């Protein structure tokens, strides 16, 4: 029989999860595995050593870090297995998968074996009765309380723009390129060795990401802020050293506009979005220029939206309105939209029974996902 819904999110960078009727997911933590990095010798401390969570969020140069879900694509299935099992903790779930409805978040344009394999997990290892995974775009629209809109994200290493009209769209008109913040930190690391800054460990890179998320802004003027002379302001270390920065703090996030510099023939969110709009109706595009949605936590910056609108207005059509500013929390909004969807009443249509799923396979999965 029906039970209490569990609102979980496939967090590319940081996984998010909670239950129905809540307002904030109480379980938000990174997407890696922390296993023994050093020589564990004398007994008397916390052992098992494959520690993920507050210990990993606390002890850094002690456990090797391994991310299995890169570009929203899980490669180390076993890692997500025990990652999910960590989600089943007394710290985290305290319940059983086989007794409550669980909502998760689908990632656009991925293979079938992924979700099929996951379905096999939660229907064989776990035996979840009610399970569904879907797009956060409509959820974001519920957060706006609107129906039409073009949802753009910035995950861990994922970006995609979706034109939407009341939950009716063209699948051919959607655009997607897996790229975000993690690679930005990678390019930051490039700048580091470009000016000789030795940063290559796992946790070391995590620290670099913290620096990236903190000591970086978005300079709207490209050449005007690149051709000049910097000051190379310094920022502390957890250890305590305050090291210089320079133009790099805005050069690395502005790289999204030029994948050619990273050796990539991409198009950039601006062109990505524009082309997505180009793949649509004619007069309806204006309505959609008004209704546009932003998402993804990598979007977090200063001089961000103004730079975006600057690009947009450089390639704008005949003066059409644009409306996407800073809501409460874009990431949370997706989870909150999951809570919204969990609050549905005719929600029974979001799944098939386990027994029938056993009699279904990939068939019902793709015949009912779309």
């Amino acid at each position: 029989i029906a039970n209490q819904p569990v609102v979980i999110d496939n967090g590319s960078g940081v996984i998010k999860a909670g239950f129905a009727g809540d307002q904030i997911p109480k379980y938000c933590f990174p997407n890696y595995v922390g296993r023994p990095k050093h020589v564990r010798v004398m007994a008397g401390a916390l052992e098992g050593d494959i520690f993920i969570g507050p210990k990993a969020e606390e002890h850094r140069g002690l456990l090797s870090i391994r991310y299995p879900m890169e570009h929203g694509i899980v490669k180390d299935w076993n890692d997500m297995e025990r990652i999910w099992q960590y989600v089943y903790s007394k710290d985290q779930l305290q319940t059983f998968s086989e007794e409550h409805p669980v909502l998760l978040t689908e990632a656009p344009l991925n293979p079938r074996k992924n979700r099929e394999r996951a379905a096999e997990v939660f229907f064989e290892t776990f035996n979840v009765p009610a399970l569904f995974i879907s797009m956060q775009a409509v959820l974001s629209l519920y957060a706006t309380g609107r129906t039409t809109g073009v949802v753009l994200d910035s995950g861990d290493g994922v970006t995609h723009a979706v034109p939407i009209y009341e939950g009716f769209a063209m699948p051919h008109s959607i655009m997607r390129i897996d790229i975000a913040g993690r690679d930005v930190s990678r390019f930051l690391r490039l700048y580091l060795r470009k000016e000789g800054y030795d940063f290559h460990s796992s946790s070391e890179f995590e620290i670099v990401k913290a620096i990236k998320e903190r000591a970086c802004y978005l300079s709207i003027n490209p050449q005007k802020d690149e051709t000049l002379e910097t000051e190379k302001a310094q920022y502390y270390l957890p250890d305590g050293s305050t090291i210089e920065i320079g133009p790099s703090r805005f050069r690395a996030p502005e790289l999204l506009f030029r994948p050619d510099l990273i050796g990539e023939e991409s198009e950039g969110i601006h062109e990505v979005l524009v082309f997505a709009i180009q793949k649509s109706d004619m007069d309806l595009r204006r309505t959609l220029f008004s209704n546009i949605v932003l998402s993804g936590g990598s979007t977090l910056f200063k001089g961000f939206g103004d730079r975006l609108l600057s690009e947009v207005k450089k390639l704008a059509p005949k003066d059409v309105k644009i409306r996407i500013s800073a809501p409460q929390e874009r990431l949370y909004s997706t989870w909150i939209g999951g809570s919204i969807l969990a609050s549905l009443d005719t929600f029974k249509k979001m799944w098939v029974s386990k027994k029938e799923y056993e009699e279904d396979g990939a068939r019902s999965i793709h015949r009912k996902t779309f």
Partner: protein, 52 residues
Amino acid sequence: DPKYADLPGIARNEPDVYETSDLPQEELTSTSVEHIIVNPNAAYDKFKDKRV
């Protein structure tokens, strides 16, 4: 200090602690465009019977 008396090696005056002197965002108010508010409950009420 029972055991300490038997210790020929005892000298005081320095403690056994290492403690010297002690001395103890625009993605929110972007004036660029407009955004939405959270409003969970009333949004569900707004979308109350908007099912299939």
